[PDB]
Structure formats: C-alpha cells, structure tokens
Write a protein that binds this ligand. Structure first.
Ligand SMILES: CC[C@@H](CC(=O)N[C@H]1[C@@H]2C[C@H]3C[C@@H](C2)C[C@@H]1C3)n1c(N)nc2cc(Cl)ccc21
Length: 377
C-alpha cells in the first residue's frame, strides 16, 4: 500500500485532506477526510475562500438527481444540489466509481479561510447521511462497485503543516508498532464505540461508566479535541488539575477560553498526567486501553500574533453530544475502521510524537465487568 502512504495533508487545526478527482475529464479537489459524517459534499460555486470548486458543466458524466440538501449545525450550515459523477483517488486504489455528490451552493461558517480543502468526505454510515439513509455514502458505493475490501485505516501525524495516511482497503504494517486491539462498533451510524473506564495517571475515576458514553462515544477525524460529556469533563479536569499542582493556572485555560505560555522552549511535560481510556474488547468481560500524552492534549498554537512565546490550548472540552475521540486521541494511534467485521482497531502509531520518559500505548487484555451496561438506551 505504498501507493497510499502519506496521501493526507493539512494545516494545524484545519483538518486532514486527501486529493480526489470528480467528473470527466477529472477535476482535482482537496477533500477533508471526516469519519463523523456520511455525505460526500463539495464547493460548487466560487466562494472567495475556495482555491478550486466543482464545475458540473465541464463533466460529461455528471447526472443531476434533481434534489436539494440542507444541512444546519450549531453555528452555521451547508446547502447543495444532489448528483452523481465518476470519482477516483489518485493516491488511492487504482479504480473509478459512480458516487453521490452534493454540490455545495450556499454555506455559512463551513469553509475555513486560508485552508487548502474544498469539500468533505463523510466516511461514516448511511443512517446519518443527509437528507436520509437512501443516499448511499461514498464508501458504500466504493465497496459495492469494486473489489476493494470493506475497511480503511487512518494514520494522522500532524507536524503549521500536517500529514498522514489513509489506507483504503487495507492495513499497512509499517504504520504501527506492537499489536492492534479492536473495540466493537456498537451501531453503524457514526463510528460508535463504548468507553468502559477512564484513568488519569492511574487513578481511575470511579464513575458510572455510562456517563462515559452519554449519549454516545464516537471516533471522529473531523474534530480536533477530545470531547467529554459535561459530567465526565468535570471529574477529569478536576483530576488533571490535581495532577499538575506543581503549577497553577486560571480557570479559563481549562475551559478553552484562554491559552497558556512558557518562555520559548521551556514546557514541563512531566507535571502533566497521561490519560487512559479503556475500550470494550472483542470478548465478554475483556477490555484494553489506550494511553495518550500531554503532547497530545496540549497543542501548540500557531498564532503567536500578539504573543512571542510557546502558547498551548487545553485540547479537552465538554460536550452535550457525547464523547468525541478527535485528533487528540487519533494522532497517538493507527486506527483501523474494520467496517467488514464491525470493529475499530487501535495500535501505537509509528509517527506519533514521543519523548524520553513516556510513550503513547495500547495495552491488553484487562478484565472489566458489566461493559454492556456502559452504553446508552
Ligand atoms: C459530529 C462532530 C462534528 C465536528 C465538527 O463540527 N467538525 C467541523 C470541522 C470544520 C468544518 C468542516 C468539517 C470539520 C465539518 C465541521 C465543519 N462534525 C463532523 N465530524 N462532521 C461534521 C459535519 C457537519 Cl455539517 C457538522 C458537524 C460535523
């Protein structure tokens, strides 16, 4: 799969994109890779932030579905016109497929000024496809129309400039070390999984595990942060806050309302606790755990714009939508979306940012009881 290694690019906090082509002759676009949604959507109009956009008039293979889509979210929205056309992935499997494309024709606070992507490849399941589940997601089309196996994997590196690999239809063994550990995909809408235990340094957190998955826990390359339900956010920060009593910070920092700086090059990582999530294992009463570092949840901020030094954002934040395992979790690990076997595998990434003393890890097996009681009904 060396065709596919390092085919992801991007910029810090603007997401990871892959090169894709649409229509005949092919139009090249950068497309944000997103495991948190299920539409293939693309700029179709000359919005001033876009570098390029889908021009259906040039495509002899485009077919109008005569149907509009409206997708609103907390702050903004995208809207578009549905269609199908021929899609391929240059640094992907050497194949072409007829897929659905939403031609984005109006949006608010969707595109990122200064980014180099022009659309979004929602890699998740039909059940959260918009406007409804009859709109076949890109990846279903791909598997259905070719001999590509039903799974992909992400190695997200990140470092302004980021890179990674999306392996379509397989696993590249050089992208990780140690062994893959798999957690079940609870239902096929988002990539839903169940967290069964949470430890900060080692001190578990002693919460009804159900809090950890309220009302869901997902895996999302479209989110930067590790996001925790309100209640789990408290006990974690309060416990992280205790772990790092070699220093004192304003309450606003923990809230992701203000950032924090140290003389250019003098951050003490050791004051900061490792974080462990245990995930439901493949077997009754069996879990494993993933461990991330401060280097994962304290992220550099580019904008030393009215500052000089090394300022970091607390990259763990609260949620009314459940746990989101975003880039903060994913950049530690190689992640296999084993769609065919309804499961997600994690392994220590070969690219991840390690230091001298501590290392991101994936360990098992452990014994955890009542794991099914951790899901939401
Ligand atoms: C469910 C979690 C959220 C997180 C999120 O809001 N991501 C942002 C981010 C920046 C823009 C482009 C892309 C990644 C989706 C969305 C807007 N999310 C994801 N993963 N894909 C989304 C698509 C939409 Cl229309 C709204 C929220 C989305």
């Amino acid at each position: 799969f060396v065709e596919m290694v390092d085919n992801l690019r991007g910029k810090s906090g603007q997401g990871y994109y892959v090169e894709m082509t649409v229509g005949s002759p092919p139009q090249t676009l950068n497309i944000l890779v997103d495991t948190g949604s299920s539409n293939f959507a693309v700029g179709a109009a000359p919005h001033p932030f876009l570098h390029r956009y889908y021009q259906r008039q040039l495509s002899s293979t485009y077919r109008d579905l005569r149907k509009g889509v409206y997708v609103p979210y907390t702050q903004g929205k995208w809207e578009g016109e549905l269609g199908t056309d021929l899609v391929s992935i240059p640094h992907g499997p050497n194949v072409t497929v007829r897929a659905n494309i939403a031609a984005i024709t109006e949006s608010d606070k969707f595109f990122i000024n200064g980014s180099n992507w022009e659309g979004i490849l929602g890699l998740a399941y039909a059940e959260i496809a918009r406007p409804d589940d009859s709109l076949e997601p890109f990846f279903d089309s791909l598997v259905k129309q070719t001999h590509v196996p039903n799974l992909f994997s992400l190695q997200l590196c990140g470092a302004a400039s980021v890179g990674g690999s999306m392996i379509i239809g397989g696993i590249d063994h050089s992208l990780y070390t140690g062994s893959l550990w798999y957690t079940p995909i609870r239902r096929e809408w988002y990539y839903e999984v169940i967290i069964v235990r949470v430890e900060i340094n080692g001190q578990d957190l002693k919460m009804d595990c159900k809090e950890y998955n309220y009302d869901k826990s997902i895996v999302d390359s479209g989110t930067t942060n590790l996001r925790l339900p309100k209640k789990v956010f408290e006990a974690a920060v309060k416990s992280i806050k205790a772990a790092s009593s070699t220093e004192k910070f304003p309450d606003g920092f923990w809230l992701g309302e203000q950032l924090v700086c140290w003389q250019a090059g003098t951050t003490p990582w050791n004051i900061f606790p490792v974080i462990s999530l245990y995930l439901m294992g493949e077997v009754t009463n069996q879990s494993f755990r993933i461990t991330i570092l401060p280097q994962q949840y304290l992220r550099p901020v580019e904008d030393v714009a009215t500052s000089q030094d090394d300022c970091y954002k607390f990259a763990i934040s609260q949620s009314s939508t459940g746990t989101v395992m975003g880039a903060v979790i994913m950049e530690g690990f190689y992640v296999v979306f084993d769609r065919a076997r309804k499961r997600i595998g994690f392994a220590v990434s070969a690219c991840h940012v390690h230091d001298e003393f501590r290392t991101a890890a994936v360990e098992g097996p452990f014994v955890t009881l009542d794991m099914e009681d951790c899901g939401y009904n």
